[PDB]
Design a protein around this ligand. Sequence first.
Ligand SMILES: NC(=O)C1=CN([C@@H]2O[C@H](COP(=O)(O)OP(=O)(O)OC[C@H]3O[C@@H](n4cnc5c(N)ncnc54)[C@H](OP(=O)(O)O)[C@@H]3O)[C@@H](O)[C@H]2O)C=CC1
Ligand SMILES: NC(=O)C1=CN([C@@H]2O[C@H](COP(=O)(O)OP(=O)(O)OC[C@H]3O[C@@H](n4cnc5c(N)ncnc54)[C@H](OP(=O)(O)O)[C@@H]3O)[C@@H](O)[C@H]2O)C=CC1
Ligand SMILES: NC(=O)C1=CN([C@@H]2O[C@H](COP(=O)(O)OP(=O)(O)OC[C@H]3O[C@@H](n4cnc5c(N)ncnc54)[C@H](OP(=O)(O)O)[C@@H]3O)[C@@H](O)[C@H]2O)C=CC1
Ligand SMILES: NC(=O)C1=CN([C@@H]2O[C@H](COP(=O)(O)OP(=O)(O)OC[C@H]3O[C@@H](n4cnc5c(N)ncnc54)[C@H](OP(=O)(O)O)[C@@H]3O)[C@@H](O)[C@H]2O)C=CC1
Ligand SMILES: *c1nc2c(ncn2[C@@H]2O[C@H](COP(=O)(O)O)[C@@H](O)[C@H]2O)c(=O)[nH]1
Ligand SMILES: O=c1[nH]cnc2c1ncn2[C@@H]1O[C@H](COP(=O)(O)O)[C@@H](O)[C@H]1O
Ligand SMILES: O=c1[nH]cnc2c1ncn2[C@@H]1O[C@H](COP(=O)(O)O)[C@@H](O)[C@H]1O
Ligand SMILES: O=c1[nH]cnc2c1ncn2[C@@H]1O[C@H](COP(=O)(O)O)[C@@H](O)[C@H]1O
Lengths: 328, 328, 328, 329
Amino acid sequence: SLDFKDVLLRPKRSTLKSRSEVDLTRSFSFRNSKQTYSGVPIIAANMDTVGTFEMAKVLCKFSLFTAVHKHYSLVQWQEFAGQNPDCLEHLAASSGTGSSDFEQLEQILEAIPQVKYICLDVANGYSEHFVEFVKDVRKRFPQHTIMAGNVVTGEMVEELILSGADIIKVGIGPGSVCTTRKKTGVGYPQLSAVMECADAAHGLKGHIISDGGCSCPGDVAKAFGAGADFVMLGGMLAGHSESGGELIERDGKKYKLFYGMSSEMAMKKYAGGVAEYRASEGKTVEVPFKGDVEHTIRDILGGIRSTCTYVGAAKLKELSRRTTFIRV
Amino acid sequence: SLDFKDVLLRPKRSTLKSRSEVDLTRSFSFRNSKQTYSGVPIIAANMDTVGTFEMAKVLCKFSLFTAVHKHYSLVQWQEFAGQNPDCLEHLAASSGTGSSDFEQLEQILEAIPQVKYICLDVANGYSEHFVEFVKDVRKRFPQHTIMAGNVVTGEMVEELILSGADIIKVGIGPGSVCTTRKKTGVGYPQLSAVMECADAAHGLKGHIISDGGCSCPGDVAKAFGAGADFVMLGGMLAGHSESGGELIERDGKKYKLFYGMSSEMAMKKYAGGVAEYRASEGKTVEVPFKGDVEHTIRDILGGIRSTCTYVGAAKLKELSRRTTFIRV
Amino acid sequence: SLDFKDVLLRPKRSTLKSRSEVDLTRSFSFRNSKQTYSGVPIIAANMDTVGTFEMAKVLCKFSLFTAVHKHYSLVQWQEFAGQNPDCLEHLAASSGTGSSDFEQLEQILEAIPQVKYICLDVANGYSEHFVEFVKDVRKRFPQHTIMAGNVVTGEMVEELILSGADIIKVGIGPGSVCTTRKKTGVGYPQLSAVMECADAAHGLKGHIISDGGCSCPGDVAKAFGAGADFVMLGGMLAGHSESGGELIERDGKKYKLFYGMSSEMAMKKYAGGVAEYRASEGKTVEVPFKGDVEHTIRDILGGIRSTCTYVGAAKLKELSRRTTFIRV
Amino acid sequence: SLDFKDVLLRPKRSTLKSRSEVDLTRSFSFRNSKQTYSGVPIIAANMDTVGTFEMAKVLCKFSLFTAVHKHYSLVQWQEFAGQNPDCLEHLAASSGTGSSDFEQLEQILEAIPQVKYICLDVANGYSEHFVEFVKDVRKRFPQHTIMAGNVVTGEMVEELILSGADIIKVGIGPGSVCTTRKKTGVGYPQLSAVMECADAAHGLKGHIISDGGCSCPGDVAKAFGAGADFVMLGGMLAGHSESGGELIERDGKKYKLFYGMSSEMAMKKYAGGVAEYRASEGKTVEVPFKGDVEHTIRDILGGIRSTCTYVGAAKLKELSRRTTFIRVT
Ligand SMILES: NC(=O)C1=CN([C@@H]2O[C@H](COP(=O)(O)OP(=O)(O)OC[C@H]3O[C@@H](n4cnc5c(N)ncnc54)[C@H](OP(=O)(O)O)[C@@H]3O)[C@@H](O)[C@H]2O)C=CC1
Ligand SMILES: NC(=O)C1=CN([C@@H]2O[C@H](COP(=O)(O)OP(=O)(O)OC[C@H]3O[C@@H](n4cnc5c(N)ncnc54)[C@H](OP(=O)(O)O)[C@@H]3O)[C@@H](O)[C@H]2O)C=CC1
Ligand SMILES: NC(=O)C1=CN([C@@H]2O[C@H](COP(=O)(O)OP(=O)(O)OC[C@H]3O[C@@H](n4cnc5c(N)ncnc54)[C@H](OP(=O)(O)O)[C@@H]3O)[C@@H](O)[C@H]2O)C=CC1
Ligand SMILES: NC(=O)C1=CN([C@@H]2O[C@H](COP(=O)(O)OP(=O)(O)OC[C@H]3O[C@@H](n4cnc5c(N)ncnc54)[C@H](OP(=O)(O)O)[C@@H]3O)[C@@H](O)[C@H]2O)C=CC1
Ligand SMILES: *c1nc2c(ncn2[C@@H]2O[C@H](COP(=O)(O)O)[C@@H](O)[C@H]2O)c(=O)[nH]1
Ligand SMILES: O=c1[nH]cnc2c1ncn2[C@@H]1O[C@H](COP(=O)(O)O)[C@@H](O)[C@H]1O
Ligand SMILES: O=c1[nH]cnc2c1ncn2[C@@H]1O[C@H](COP(=O)(O)O)[C@@H](O)[C@H]1O
Ligand SMILES: O=c1[nH]cnc2c1ncn2[C@@H]1O[C@H](COP(=O)(O)O)[C@@H](O)[C@H]1O
């Protein structure tokens, strides 16, 4: 029942001389889409303040991935893709399960063929309705790679992969601005979830994303060491120039809003308020302004290269197999 | 030795599509009164700041229950009942073991025949005196549903049910303004208390209330998942317009008093003071003003519907069967 | 490896009706002095700010015990004894191992025959030198009851009782103003120390004092439940009118100094400062002023009566038999 | 998986009557250099703010050891050595693995023959490159005692001794101004590291230094109790008159900078800044000014003498043997 904070990685004898030797890119072949990936498998979350086109343009320079948020117009996507043809390779267009979500997704994918990834995202990936929607999307777009979540346990990972998803998004409640655990009491320790779900997915030649709960580069490295193919970040990418969220300067200091997608703040913006039978399951915070995201990416990547050197991993694909966790 | 903070509920595969589909009402048939209940089994605690007639009026609209405090006059009761006849089915009148308390209860029940629940409430329900009192109240009021507590272990749950109580109130020391544990060292972790006492009660076709220790909706869901038939709330319901407690406006902010029923504040108010051989076993806090309780009810119920969807429960009665706790 | 915080007492079926029914006095017959005791076995520590004459005078009225500090003159003792002839029964005169300490102790005992207890107190009761001192004091005063400490393990409890001590003082490092653990790393969790040492002592028909680490009446109740015959209190008794320590009014609030007997404050007062080879093993704090100690005594005794009613103990003597600890 | 905070020492019967009776010196014979040591085996860390010449001069008086930082020039070393001929016996010159570092060290050792210890110090002692370096250094200076680290596990302790190191420096991430754990997730709880590495070292009649994570005298005592031959201190020695770090008087209070050697502050000073592929693995703090280090040394040593009296150790040599740890919540 482990969280990131409960472990450390044991160092091991290595032949690496310098952190600059470490290759942080991965190559994957996806189970169902049959497409191939090559890049640095860290993903900007599809939160409205994080999965922005400005984030994408910077993350592209480092070969990182963006799951674009679901609140841009087709026109905005077309403007982005026209101005940034070389950044469409590691983007996913996102959708929930509504008719309207699906139709807007379609419009994007039809108009911008270079977008080859789909991020299907719900709070509760255990619903049969969600499973059925994944099948539906696989059938409509057989050659796109599908990321689907969220879940925390292997039976659901398997069902979702067998239903047509390529990459399962793992995590219920670990997120920095999530309040699901406080409102519902439901969840799973994130490191344990990653280990269980990685094993399940990899038994089927599928993949996973560790989604949420990382607050330092060491956490990112732990999720990878536990078998995550990709790691998705919200909070660590919030608060930058390139992030969304209002910039607030008060009492001589600068902040940016950062908020859960099921916070009252988000529901006020996009659902016309909070439905009577719902409770909010995210919160709002004000993040001290961090400046340009490039400096944060370099810190994260720098940390992970260090991790690899300490365990003797010359390439990110070696990190999990050379990871021995010490309980602390 | 589990508390609510030590666990999460595991999600499970679900045919539920929306949280709006979840029915939170239960029906119970009581062992000794032979009466039947229908409602949302969340009870406002019989504290003078929580179990108020203003609270009852609002909770009634949501089919929630109020254990009315023991400090209203007979005419206040008569006035309430006259003005709010449809509220009377979801209320209990309360008493401790004092001859004065019981006599005032008898006058209320004589005046208000519509009150069909009795809440017999002492700090130490392990006393043979309390056991005997319960037997006497059963003999006196054969058709009234009797809630009796408090205890934390099965042997006492069984004895209390066999002596004539329908519903056993579980918890010693977990309350937000309780200081019993600090003053006496006595108590029992609440989640374990609920698990153990639920098994003991259910084996005899009786019922329990998890009383105390919930500070968010997820805790309430954990209590129900652990087998509690009802959950009683003090602090979560304190600090509202409908709550008791002085409203205090100071340093630009508003607060409401909230205090334990064995605090010095309560004893000064209703015993004249603290008797020489006694210690206070409650504290006072100032709760930032919360506004109208309807918003808090909606949040709590919304959290629990979300729990139910995550574990596949279409009805609250299915929650405990569908609950697998993960240790955190 | 239990500290007080690690456990709660399980409640049990009781025939107690009222906390007023509980007798907190104990009767002891001491192994080596052959003297008898009757009183409430809580002791004000022999710290210079706690074991004062003003403290004794109040504690006396409750039948509590005072280990008088070792920094009164003989004239001071005679004055107290002359003015308070009925408060001499539950007093001890204190000494360390030095010849000047012994000479002063001897003057007190000779001049004040009503003083029938001796408190032999060193930081490190494991020294053969302390053992031999205990033996010598036993030989010199065969009808005086000897408290001796401090130690935390059974073997040493036994040695000290067999060397002539009646009551063994248990605790190394738990005290509120102690820094031994930070400075040395030496200690033993106090609840486990009490359980182990009480068994060792009782097997020889001797007694122990749980010395240090209580910060609420619940802790005192836990110590007694774990088998301690007496409980000694420093911090809980510091900061009262009757306490020593300078009264400091600053920034409109009142405080009283409270410091370790191994602190730099103490060694400056009574040694020539700190010897080059020693480190201080106590600290200084300013305790917000508590007023009269009577109120604190009532809070402590009331808490312990409540513990006894909860576990079915009519007498403090029964509390440890009736104690079942639950680990939290 | 223990840290210092997870344990206490159990007192035991003794015949000691005063803390002043306790002998805190140790004598060691080193496996590979064959040289001998007599002193109090607490070492000032080779951080630029701790392993200074001012520090060394004071620690000398108490028979404590200094691993000098690697950022003094030859001329500064010669000045020190000419004014303090007797303080040279418990000094180590430090180096990392680069050719420039090796050359600086080689000049110091050639110019000042009285310096008989070498501290080879990298963040990652698990590197084959580091092992080959230790071997090269043992080849070049066969009679110098070599401290080499850092590592946290016994296999690497063994390999480094077999490769020619005498004393292995143990600790990855426990340090007060280290952020390696937050940046990489890598580490090992320090008390357990010490117990494992001390067994591995001692099997081969080598020695270890517990490096990092001590924040009170008790932690020092615990490290010795777990079998560390030496204990190295950064934070506990920062903030003094003798420490490096700028003295900053602000808001009516005095502070001294103390920072990790992998911090942005250090890399700005000694490298070009931070290379694009590196992350900072240390932080900067401002430590309230502590005054003269002598007073801190006396507090540390008095603490450890007290531990020894409580467990019956008349000499520091006895402490580990007489140590029984109790696990604490
Ligand atoms: N990671 C997260 O927590 C995220 C949460 N949201 C939140 O999810 C909810 C639905 O989002 P929307 O975009 O309208 O539709 P989606 O496309 O996200 O599809 C989710 C569907 O699942 C249903 N549902 C069933 N169980 C749950 C549950 N336990 N928690 C949340 N939804 C559940 C919702 O219905 P119903 O609401 O009737 O129960 C909704 O129809 C909103 O409250 C939204 O703010 C949105 C994005 C990410
Ligand atoms: N559930 C919990 O953890 C707690 C609940 N309470 C709440 O606060 C109210 C405060 O009432 P309070 O004045 O404490 O007493 P109660 O209302 O519980 O007292 C009823 C009778 O129990 C007796 N009694 C016996 N043992 C105890 C004991 N250990 N603690 C308290 N009473 C005891 C009292 O006698 P006597 O006073 O002479 O001893 C009295 O005659 C309770 O009625 C309850 O609603 C209070 C504390 C803890
Ligand atoms: N509970 C506590 O921590 C108490 C602390 N004190 C402290 O104990 C020390 C001696 O007090 P004093 O009144 O002179 O003599 P004491 O009669 O209290 O006896 C203590 C004797 O034990 C010796 N000793 C051996 N080991 C230790 C140790 N680990 N810690 C403390 N003393 C030890 C002392 O010699 P030496 O000092 O040379 O080592 C001293 O001669 C002082 O520093 C004093 O402040 C006094 C009473 C109780
Ligand atoms: N003991 C500990 O917990 C730590 C100690 N440090 C202290 O700070 C200094 C840091 O300077 P720095 O250059 O960062 O490290 P080092 O002094 O340890 O560098 C020596 C060589 O090791 C290489 N190296 C390989 N892996 C790593 C790694 N994981 N982390 C750091 N270097 C690695 C470096 O190359 P390249 O830089 O190209 O990768 C460099 O060429 C150390 O010398 C040490 O004093 C720093 C962090 C942790
Ligand atoms: C719960 N979880 C939520 C909410 N909005 C987003 N998220 C989740 O958090 C992840 C990011 O976690 P960080 O710790 O910030 O990196 C997102 O990717 C998503 O899974 C919400 O309102 N409630
Ligand atoms: O003074 C007190 N001491 C201990 N428990 C109390 C006191 N007053 C009320 N309670 C308990 O605390 C419960 C509510 O706890 P909460 O919901 O955590 O605030 C009540 O229903 C009582 O059982
Ligand atoms: O300076 C000291 N160092 C360590 N223990 C001390 C010191 N001075 C007093 N004590 C102990 O602390 C006890 C009181 O502990 P307290 O009740 O937690 O404050 C005393 O009875 C002594 O045993
Ligand atoms: O920047 C850093 N990152 C990691 N460890 C460091 C850094 N700087 C110094 N250290 C280590 O920290 C030790 C001192 O730890 P301290 O005694 O807890 O402050 C040094 O001897 C080094 O091993």
